[PDB]
Design an enzyme around this catalytic site. Structure first.
Site, PDB file in Angstrom:
ATOM      1  N   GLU A 258       0.759  -1.247   0.000  1.00 44.49           N
ATOM      2  CA  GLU A 258       0.000   0.000   0.000  1.00 44.49           C
ATOM      3  C   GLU A 258       0.791   1.299   0.000  1.00 44.49           C
ATOM      4  N   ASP A 259       1.645   1.466  -1.006  1.00 50.98           N
ATOM      5  CA  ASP A 259       2.417   2.699  -1.178  1.00 50.98           C
ATOM      6  C   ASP A 259       3.564   3.027  -0.225  1.00 50.98           C
ATOM      7  N   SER A 260       4.548   2.145  -0.165  1.00 52.15           N
ATOM      8  CA  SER A 260       5.719   2.334   0.681  1.00 52.15           C
ATOM      9  C   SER A 260       6.691   1.319   0.112  1.00 52.15           C
ATOM     10  CB  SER A 260       5.391   2.019   2.135  1.00 52.15           C
TER      11      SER A 260
END
Lengths: 48, 46, 266, 65, 30, 114, 462, 43
Positions: free
Chosen positions: G184-186
């Site tokens: 999720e975006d990391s």
């Protein structure tokens, strides 16, 4: 490499930003069926 | 043999104290850094 | 001989292309990693900056000095600080290097790793020597400086390994491959029309016999043969980076048996 | 700002090869991509390392004390 | 021939000349 | 700031042993060995070899969480055969195999030019 | 550009010609035919918006001019030149863009907004804001240890002086699913590299203080006090101060240590010293004693710290791909490609489909290529480049034409059933790191009017 | 730094939008998110 264009007041580098000031134009607009006003002409008036 | 401040340009160990203004011998350029500390500083090698 | 054998292909002072045959995959890799992260080496781990005027800030140079590879062949006889009974280090666990530079030249003076100086007793053993492979003979450019810019340091190198930091690891890279013609189908090639053409061939296809359509799918097939290639930095001769590998790994697998023992008494 | 000793990704020494490479440009008049292969930098990881670093230090050096 | 057409890659040369005299800060200056 | 000290990846700390053996109750004759300050490198390996001993009915391992260097290895064997012993061999086996390779590798290296 | 068909030798055509040009690159080499010339020789005009109303314009000087007497199946699909009236023609279209946008690669390959963000993060990045920084006492500033001019570029950069003062690093990226931390975006960032110096940055801060005066002669003073009546001092450890009331550069200051000793006489020892902001910590770097018009002792101190990429730190490509670290791994645990290579970054595949930023996707290919050829790839706005046109170049090099590569799961060393889109990409390290925000409080400073906890992490607030 | 030098501001009838006349003079994609979006533009 610095390109300047900014000032230097009491130490800090100050930058004056462009202040925009379309206006003064006529346009006519049809208004929704549910309303007493039929059409209108607008004009944004402002001192250059 | 000991020091204090420095010419920000003609870098010449100056030094002084109270009320001696804050200038230099000739070039006035009232800037003056402060040079390092004798005591060795230690660092992490990573 | 008895089991897992080798057939070294090309081989120089910096690489050791070779072929590991008859081993378990686990083992191949197990080794690989070992080579990468746990081979004891030497390197700077403490910089006592006395004077610096450069444009590179203290801790900057510092970092660099660590990366700079150092000699480490006899490493295996220089105790890790943490074990030597001396309060914070001694010739028996550490190497000291000094560094001095001055802007005499009216035109940029270069500070290279060759300018390092050993000042601790070496005790007669290959160690702590700034490794060079540069043509001229001044390897790794530490930093430059102008007019009257100075730089007095002092370093202390210690053991340490790629786990505690990479600056220690000797590896620097390691080729690894197997089943060049996907026979165990350890993959599913992605295509647009035909895998074969779109997905390049490996120089390592040759040394292993091609497919042969008709044939059913071989399922009892496991994984013999791996085409490694331990490269190297220099801290160690490409060989040891492969021997000490098979060695260190081995010692570990022992300290488990050893622990299984000191645990049987109770 | 000075050459990066050793390659990020990969790990290989690379701090010496500065001048060597820089020379393969002015003197031996060559084209990047090849120059590298000659310096021994074969894989892009430890390749991009040189081809990119901008030696600001030289600019830094040019100031004064 | 000092009087023929002009391909794409050429345009740049002009732009180059633009900033040569102009500078990204023209406005603020002028 | 909260970053642990790098060296806690291999140095055991105050009061800990490389090993800790707890007897699995879920099933009969099987164990859970906790390896401290270790990881995949040695885990996966003692797991594969451990899977050959035809007397080993079960064997798998796992890193509980990346943050910590350590792992659990579960071993199951045929009644009348203690697994602890099984672990032993599987390591000896690993050493010996290596003992050869250290040799057979050098063999080929001495025979080299460059 | 002006087009006036006044060409007795044919149709309509640009007043400027390849001679005017070669007569310019001639002045370029000497570093007499300026811009002012192209203007006072009537070849180019200054058209505002109002006049723009009454003119027609050509996009490209070529394509939109010659005759019509076959067409690449990969390039785009540009309309036609159905008109012989063109009064003027655009130097280049990519000049509609502004500073920010001109750094974004292949902008003509992103959902319109994805650029609008990237046109705001490139302002939260770190680089080299000038080169005289070793001589600047500005409050707060970040320098990126090892800057790298991006592989993928824009002709527009040459004037933005980018290759001289970049703001990021070409990192060997790897778009795949792994531990599950890049979720999720990391991203999952290679520790090893982080060690060899990847993305390390500098951080300078500088406090300041003067010696306030009062016509009736009463002066503050720079000294090293201690009790003697008042008591009003500071918790910090004065000890580090020399006698002039300043810390010498070499020193290693941390907690709330003092940085400037100053005193104010009131009717005798009330403090006015300056302590290093509660949270920060580091090494002095340069002090400096000066005078200010009125004859007041003016002093600016500067502290330098080296910040290493950590787990909470924020990062981003040039396509609004903002994401933060979740975990660091090493080459042992890292997924590798036979060649040997391994990634520095590992962004999750999911961050693509809906962002619909293909440009980012392409930069990788363009860079993975010009990384091998060493020919500073061009990813400038609308041009004649293709994906097909590059897959050919990458194929000429041996690696799969789309980027993917085979890789082996670092823990075991087994192959990864699927392949991963591997290859370089420029990545900016934007400020706002974790240890600059982590903040906790269990009772502390209380407001005075309200008697409720104070505000801000700076004041120990709640 | 450059970017900041070429900036524009606009006090207080559908401004925020991207006009046709805005072509070539002002940048289309460079503007602050939310709040005063489209009131501040970049040349």
């Amino acid at each position: 490499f610095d390109m300047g264009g900014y000032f230097i007041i009491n130490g800090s580098e100050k930058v004056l930003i462009a202040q925009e000031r379309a206006g003064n134009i006529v346009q006519v607009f049809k208004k929704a069926a549910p309303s007493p006003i039929s059409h209108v002409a607008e004009i944004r008036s402002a001192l250059e | 043999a000991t020091l204090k401040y420095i010419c920000a340009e003609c870098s010449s160990k100056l030094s002084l104290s109270r009320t001696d203004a804050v200038r230099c011998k000739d070039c006035g350029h009232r800037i003056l850094l402060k040079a390092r500390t004798k005591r060795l500083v230690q660092f992490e090698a990573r | 001989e008895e089991g897992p054998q080798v057939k070294i292909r090309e081989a120089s002072k910096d690489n050791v292309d070779f072929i590991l045959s008859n081993v378990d995959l686990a083992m191949a890799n197990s080794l690989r990693r070992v080579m990468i992260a746990e081979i004891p080496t030497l390197a700077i781990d403490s910089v006592e900056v006395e004077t610096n005027t450069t444009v590179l800030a203290d801790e900057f140079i510092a970092h660099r000095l660590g990366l700079i590879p150092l000699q480490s062949m006899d490493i295996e006889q220089l105790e890790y600080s943490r074990d030597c009974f001396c309060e914070d280090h001694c010739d028996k666990c550490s190497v000291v290097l000094t560094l001095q530079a001055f802007g005499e030249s009216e035109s940029t003076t270069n500070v290279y790793s060759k300018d390092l100086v050993i000042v601790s007793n070496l005790m007669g053993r290959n160690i702590g020597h700034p490794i060079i492979q540069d043509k001229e003979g001044n390897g790794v450019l530490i930093c430059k400086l102008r007019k009257g810019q100075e730089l007095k340091l002092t370093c202390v190198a210690k053991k340490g390994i790629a786990k505690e930091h990479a600056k220690w690891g000797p590896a620097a890279a390691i080729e690894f491959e197997y089943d060049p013609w996907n026979k165990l189908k350890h993959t599913d090639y992605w295509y647009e029309q035909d895998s074969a053409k779109e997905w390049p061939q490996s120089k390592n296809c040759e040394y292993e016999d091609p497919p042969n359509e008709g044939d059913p799918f071989d399922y009892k097939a496991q994984a013999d043969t791996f085409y490694m290639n331990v490269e190297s930095v220099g801290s160690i001769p490409v060989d040891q980076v492969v021997v000490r590998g098979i060695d260190t790994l081995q010692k570990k697998v022992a300290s488990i048996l050893l622990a299984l023992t000191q645990m049987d008494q109770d | 700002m000075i050459v990066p000793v050793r390659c990020f990704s990969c790990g290989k020494v690379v701090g010496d090869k500065w001048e060597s490479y820089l020379n393969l440009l002015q003197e031996d008049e060559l084209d990047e991509g090849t120059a590298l292969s000659r310096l021994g930098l074969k894989r892009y990881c430890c390749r991009r390392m040189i081809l990119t670093h901008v030696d600001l230090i030289e600019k830094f050096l040019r100031y004064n004390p | 021939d000092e009087s023929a057409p002009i391909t794409a890659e050429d345009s740049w040369a002009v732009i180059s000349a633009f900033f040569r005299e102009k500078g990204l800060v023209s406005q603020q200056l002028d | 700031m909260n970053a642990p000290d790098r060296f806690e990846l291999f140095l055991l700390g105050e009061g800990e042993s490389k090993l800790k053996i707890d007897p699995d109750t879920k099933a009969p004759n099987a164990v859970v060995i906790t390896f401290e300050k270790e990881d995949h490198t040695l885990g996966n390996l003692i797991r594969a070899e451990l899977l050959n001993d035809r007397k080993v009915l079960f064997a798998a391992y796992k890193v509980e969480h990346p943050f910590f260097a350590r792992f659990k290895l579960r071993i199951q064997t045929t009644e009348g055969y203690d697994p602890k012993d099984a672990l032993k061999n599987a390591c000896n086996s690993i050493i010996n195999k290596l003992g050869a390779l250290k040799t057979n590798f050098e063999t080929e290296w001495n025979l080299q030019t460059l | 550009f002006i087009v006036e068909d006044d060409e007795s030798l044919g149709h309509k055509e640009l007043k400027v010609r390849k001679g005017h040009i070669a007569k310019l690159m001639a002045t370029e080499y000497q570093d007499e035919y300026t811009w002012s010339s192209l203007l006072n020789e009537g070849l180019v005009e200054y058209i505002d918006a109002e006049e723009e109303e009454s003119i027609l314009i050509a996009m490209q000087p070529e394509d939109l001019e010659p005759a019509e007497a076959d067409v690449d199946p990969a390039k785009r699909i540009r309309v036609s030149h159905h008109a012989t009236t063109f009064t003027h023609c655009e130097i280049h279209p990519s000049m509609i863009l502004g500073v920010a946008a001109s750094i974004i690669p292949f902008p003509d390959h992103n959902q319109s907004p994805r650029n609008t963000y990237q046109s705001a993060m490139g302002k939260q990045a770190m680089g080299v804001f000038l080169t005289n920084y070793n001589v600047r006492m500005d409050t707060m500033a970040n320098i990126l240890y090892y800057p790298q001019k991006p592989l993928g570029t824009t002709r527009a950069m040459e004037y933005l002086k980018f290759r001289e003062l970049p703001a990021g690093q070409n990192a060997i990226v790897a778009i795949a699913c792994y531990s599950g931390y890049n979720q999720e975006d990391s991203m999952i960032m290679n520790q090893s590299s982080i060690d060899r110096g990847l993305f390390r940055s500098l951080f300078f801060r500088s406090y300041m203080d003067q010696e306030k005066k009062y016509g009736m002669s009463i002066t503050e003073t720079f000294e090293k006090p201690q009790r003697t009546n008042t008591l009003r001092m500071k918790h910090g450890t004065y000890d580090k101060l020399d006698d002039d009331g300043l810390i010498a550069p070499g020193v290693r200051v941390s907690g709330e240590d003092v940085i400037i000793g100053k005193t104010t006489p009131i009717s005798s020892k009330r403090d006015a010293s300056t302590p290093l902001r509660s949270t920060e910590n580091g090494i002095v770097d340069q002090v400096l004693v000066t005078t200010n018009q009125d004859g007041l002792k003016f002093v600016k101190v500067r502290v330098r710290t080296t910040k290493i990429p950590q787990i909470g730190d924020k990062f981003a490509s040039r396509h609004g791909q903002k994401g933060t670290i979740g975990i660091t791994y090493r080459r042992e645990d890292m997924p590798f490609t036979a060649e040997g290579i391994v990634p520095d970054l590992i962004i999750n595949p999911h961050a693509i489909p809906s962002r619909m930023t293909v440009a980012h996707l392409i930069e990788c290919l363009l860079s993975k290529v010009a990384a091998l050829s060493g020919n500073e790839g061009d990813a400038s706005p609308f041009t004649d480049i293709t994906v097909e046109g590059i897959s050919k170049l990458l194929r000429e090099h041996g690696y799969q034409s789309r980027g993917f590569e085979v890789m082996y799961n670092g823990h075991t060393g087994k192959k990864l059933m699927a392949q991963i889109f591997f290859g370089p990409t420029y990545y900016q390290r934007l400020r706002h790191m974790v240890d600059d925000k982590i903040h906790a409080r269990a009772r502390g400073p209380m407001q005075v009017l309200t008697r409720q906890p104070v505000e801000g992490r700076s004041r120990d607030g709640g | 730094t450059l970017s900041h030098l070429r900036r524009t501001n606009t006090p207080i009838a559908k401004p925020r939008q991207l006009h046709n006349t805005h072509w070539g003079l002002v940048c289309p994609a460079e503007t602050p998110e939310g709040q005063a979006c489209g009131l501040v533009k970049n040349l």
